[PDB]
């Protein structure tokens, strides 16, 4: 685990993780819940957590904070009222700020499962959201999720 030689549970894969997730603990049920539903209802995706002490089995697994650039394509971020206050938020942060002013936008997809007070961070400020607690958005909200992460950050190919 960790940083460990011979940990592979998907067969180690040359496709590396897809995205990773950064949540809030006060709101973590809905996490839990979104993970498999995703693999339930998608294009097959393959992810990381920051904390995998947790979660409902869930196949992921335990990579370096300096490496999740080189080991995610992309980072799911859970915008909680929790999450924002949290070292959470930071983390995401600090990994943005290695990326590049404008890309880490785009390599960044906030994920809103509530409606809270706080102001939000220049380093996200709501690029693209999808709200859960929107029943307008949540019907294939799973698989809409799951689409924007089978599709590799941007890479315009799929028409444009």
Same mark, same amino acid.
């Given at each position: 685990?960790?940083? =460990? =030689?011979?940990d592979?549970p998907?067969g %180690?894969?040359p496709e590396?993780f897809? *995205?990773?997730? /950064?949540? /809030?603990?006060?709101? @973590?049920?809905?996490?839990?819940?979104? @993970?498999?539903?995703?693999?339930?209802?998608?294009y097959?995706?393959? !992810?990381?957590?920051s904390?995998?002490?947790?979660?409902p089995?869930?196949?992921?697994?335990? @990579? *370096?904070?300096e !490496?999740?650039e080189?080991r995610?394509?992309r980072?799911?971020v859970?915008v909680s009222?929790?999450? $924002?206050?949290s070292?959470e938020?930071?983390?995401? =942060?600090?990994? *943005? $700020?290695?990326?590049?002013?404008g890309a880490h936008?785009?390599?960044?997809?906030?994920?809103?499962?509530?409606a809270?007070?706080?102001?939000?961070?220049?380093?996200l400020r709501? @690029?693209?959201?999808?709200?859960? =607690?929107?029943?307008?958005?949540?019907?294939?909200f799973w698989t809409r999720?799951a689409?924007?992460?089978?599709?590799?950050?941007?890479?315009?190919? %799929?028409?444009?």
């Amino acid at each position: 685990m960790g940083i =460990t =030689t011979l940990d592979d549970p998907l067969g %180690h894969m040359p496709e590396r993780f897809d *995205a990773f997730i /950064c949540y /809030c603990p006060s709101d @973590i049920q809905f996490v839990q819940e979104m @993970i498999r539903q995703l693999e339930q209802t998608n294009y097959r995706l393959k !992810l990381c957590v920051s904390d995998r002490d947790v979660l409902p089995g869930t196949c992921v697994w335990s @990579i *370096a904070s300096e !490496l999740i650039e080189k080991r995610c394509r992309r980072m799911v971020v859970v915008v909680s009222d929790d999450y $924002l206050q949290s070292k959470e938020c930071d983390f995401q =942060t600090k990994f *943005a $700020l290695s990326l590049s002013p404008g890309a880490h936008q785009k390599r960044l997809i906030p994920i809103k499962y509530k409606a809270m007070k706080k102001e939000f961070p220049s380093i996200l400020r709501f @690029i693209t959201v999808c709200d859960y =607690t929107n029943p307008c958005t949540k019907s294939w909200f799973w698989t809409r999720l799951a689409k924007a992460l089978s599709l590799p950050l941007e890479h315009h190919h %799929h028409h444009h």
